[PDB]
């Protein structure tokens, strides 16, 4: 069996065992493995599910800590706040490193190899996603550039998705979901967010009406967010 075939099998084991840092490493090998061709749908998906879970943990930890820090600083208790933030820094450094590894992999290998609308929107979305994860905790000029980077990646992703993929396509549907969340949570623009979310959802329903558990779930998320934001 080929080496690439092994790493893939290994990554699927890492996933079952829920050791995502390792699942990332394996798919990271398969990535840097081939040069001419691009990752299969399964491989491309395993790579982001892996990163998604690695970043997702620190993101959850970050929210908990951040939430606690808030409650404590508004309690006046300062001795705690310094320890909460000292801990948050640590969580944030990891988020930075995680985001950095996948962003570099996106520019060096992932994006250059996208030979279709499917993978191009996919990788461009990831690009935006991780600059977004940065923007969630950054604040000063760092936030501004993470935001700018997010917007650029999502817009580039949207141009391709809007023309090359169906409104029912899950990648395109997910791009809309995230892009609209970006407007609502980082740009604090519920107007631009709702328009986008509503528009993508409507086009999906339209296409569906005239002429995938995959896309159905994403649409349910778009709706939950729409109703959610209408409060």
């Amino acid at each position: 069996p080929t080496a690439r075939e092994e790493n893939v099998y290994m990554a699927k084991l890492a996933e079952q065992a829920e050791r995502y840092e390792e699942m990332v490493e394996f798919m990271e090998k398969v990535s840097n493995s081939l040069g001419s061709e691009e990752l299969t749908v399964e491989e491309r998906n395993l790579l982001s599910v892996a990163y998604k879970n690695v970043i997702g943990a620190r993101r959850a930890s970050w929210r908990i800590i951040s939430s606690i820090e808030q409650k404590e600083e508004s309690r006046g208790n300062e001795e705690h706040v310094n320890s909460i933030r000292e801990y948050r820094s640590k969580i944030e450094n990891e988020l930075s490193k995680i985001c950095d590894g996948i962003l570099k992999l996106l520019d060096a290998k992932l994006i250059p190899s996208a030979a279709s609308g499917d993978s191009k929107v996919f990788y461009l979305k990831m690009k935006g996603d991780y600059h977004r994860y940065l923007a969630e905790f950054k604040t000063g000029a760092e936030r501004k550039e993470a935001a700018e980077s997010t917007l650029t990646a999502y817009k580039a992703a949207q141009d391709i998705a809007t023309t090359e993929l169906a409104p029912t396509h899950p990648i395109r549907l997910g791009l809309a979901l995230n892009f609209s969340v970006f407007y609502y949570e980082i740009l604090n623009s519920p107007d631009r967010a709702c328009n986008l979310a509503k528009q993508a959802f409507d086009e999906a329903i339209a296409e569906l009406d005239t002429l995938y558990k995959d896309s159905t779930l994403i649409m349910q998320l778009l709706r939950d967010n729409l109703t959610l934001w209408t409060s």
Binding site: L177, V181, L221, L228
Partner: peptide, 5 residues
Amino acid sequence: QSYTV
């Protein structure tokens, strides 16, 4: 926060 994928 909001739902993302």
